[PDB]
Structure formats: structure tokens, C-alpha cells
Paper text:
Thus, in most cases, the amides 5a-5e, showed almost no inhibition against all the subclass B1 MBLs (IC50 values ∼50 or >50 µM), when the para-position of the phenyl ring was mono-functionalised with halogen or alkyl groups. Similar trends were observed for the enethiols 6a-6L, although IC50 values are mostly in the nanomolar range across all the MBLs tested.
Metallo-β-lactamases (MBLs) enable bacterial resistance to almost all classes of β-lactam antibiotics. There are two mechanistic types of β-lactamase – the serine β-lactamases (SBLs), which employ a nucleophilic serine (Ambler classes A, C, D) and the metallo-β-lactamases (MBLs), which utilise a Zn(II) bound hydroxide in β-lactam hydrolysis (class B). The enethiols inhibit MBLs from different subclasses. Crystallographic analyses reveal that the enethiol sulphur displaces the di-Zn(II) ion bridging ‘hydrolytic’ water.
Numbering used by the authors: 36 to 257
The structure:
């Protein structure tokens, strides 16, 4: 697939189909680069992102790269939980007039932790349409965090698992300070029950996979 990088290599976009790309950014933490993934949706009414990035500098540069390439503005972002990889660029979004969608719980947690607040407009199931691009958001229950949601593209059967879903390279659950490891299995089961025919699964970190990433996450939770 087509892969396009910034000069530093810290931001990359990879094409999944004509209108759907994965964005990946490296956040540097004590000398260790840590990548994280979101989506870029190229719609007839603008660009929509699933997730920002670790901080405002990276978010600014991601927006600028995609607006230049796709020749449209970023209009909306969906924030999938209130950790820095997802929400760290919220100040940039607000000051540019980019709408930052989230559940109410994600917005409360953002505020509790000193971030600017997203809209708190998403429910347990929300169906959005941007141009011709359909987007469903789903709260499956607690897992990696109490608030994590997934994003589904029904025209492509693409699931953005976010940090609820571990990549094949993840050999443990990672940081579980804010996680609910009992509920996590049930939450993944709720995803597997809702979306029974999945073409790709985008984890929060690591390589794109398929429903096997869900099953891998269930095994890590044993
Ligand atoms: O494993 C992950 O998906 C994530 S988001 C871990 C994590 C976290 F628990 C707290 C803060 C943060 F900045 C993080 F990156
Ligand atoms: Zn997280
Ligand atoms: Zn994460």
C-alpha cells in the first residue's frame, strides 16, 4: 500500500483504500520511540480524523500534511479515550475550529486530567455521516480504560479498535493503571458480537490486522 512520510519520519500515512488512511506518529519517551495509530478519512466535505496525536506539535504537523496532500480542510476528529496518544492535540483542534467529538465520559476524564474538553456528544452508539462517509462509534464497555470506544466504517467493514485492541507484536497488556482487566474480555466480546464480518482492524499501536487481533487481546487477558 502507499506510504507517505514527513521529513523526520515521525509521521506516516498508509493507504487502506481510496478514502481511508492510517496515520502513525512516533512519540519519544525517555529515549524510546512509541508509535501510535489513528485514521484519516477523505470525504467530500473535508477530512475527518480518528484520534489526534501525543502532543500539539505532532497534531499540527499531521493536520498540515493531510490538508496539503488531500487539498481539503480537517473538519472533525473523533477522540477514542482520554490518554495523551489520543487527545494530546486537543488544544490545536479547538483553536483551529476543528470539532473534537467524544463521549461524555471521555470529556469528563479529559477535564479531570487537565486537558481541554472535547464535545461529549457521542452516545453508546452514534452514527455520523461526513459527506458520503459513514462512521459509527460504539462504547463496548471498560477495558484498556473505562471510557474507550471503537469506530466502525460500515462501507468498508473497517474497525478502529484503538487501544482496546492489542497488535500481534504486543506480548502483554501494556500500561494497566487505568484498565479494567476483568471487564476487558467482555468488552471485546461485545465488539465481536456487534461486528461479525470484519475486513481490517486498526489497533491503537502496531500493525493493522484482522479479527485475530481481538482474539489475541482475549488471550493476553488470560
Ligand atoms: O497502551 C496504551 O495503548 C496506552 S494509550 C498507554 C498509555 C497510558 F496507559 C497512559 C498514558 C499514556 F500516554 C499512554 F500512552
Ligand atoms: Zn490509552
Ligand atoms: Zn494507546
Amino acid at each position: 500500500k502507499t506510504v507517505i512520510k514527513n521529513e523526520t519520519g515521525t509521521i506516516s500515512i498508509s493507504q487502506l483504500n481510496k478514502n481511508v488512511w492510517v496515520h502513525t506518529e512516533l512519540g519519544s519517551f525517555n529515549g524510546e520511540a512509541v508509535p501510535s495509530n489513528g485514521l484519516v478519512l477523505n470525504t467530500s466535505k473535508g477530512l475527518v480524523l480518528v484520534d489526534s496525536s501525543w502532543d500539539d506539535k505532532l497534531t499540527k504537523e499531521l493536520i498540515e500534511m493531510v490538508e496539503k496532500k488531500f487539498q481539503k480542510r480537517v473538519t472533525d476528529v473523533i477522540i477514542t479515550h482520554a490518554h495523551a496518544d489520543r487527545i494530546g492535540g486537543i488544544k490545536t483542534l479547538k483553536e483551529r475550529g476543528i470539532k473534537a467529538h467524544s463521549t461524555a465520559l471521555t470529556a469528563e476524564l479529559a477535564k479531570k486530567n487537565g486537558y481541554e474538553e472535547p464535545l461529549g456528544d457521542l452516545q453508546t452508539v452514534t452514527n455520523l455521516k461526513f459527506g458520503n462517509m459513514k462512521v459509527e462509534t460504539f462504547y463496548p464497555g471498560k477495558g484498556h480504560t473505562e471510557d474507550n470506544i471503537v469506530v466502525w466504517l460500515p462501507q468498508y467493514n473497517i474497525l478502529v479498535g484503538g487501544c482496546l485492541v492489542k497488535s500481534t507484536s504486543a506480548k502483554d497488556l501494556g500500561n494497566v493503571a487505568d484498565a479494567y482487566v476483568n471487564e476487558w474480555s467482555t468488552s471485546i466480546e461485545n465488539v465481536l458480537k456487534r461486528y461479525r464480518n470484519i475486513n481490517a482492524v486498526v489497533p491503537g499501536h502496531g500493525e493493522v490486522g484482522d479479527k485475530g487481533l481481538l482474539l489475541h487481546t482475549l488471550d493476553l487477558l488470560k
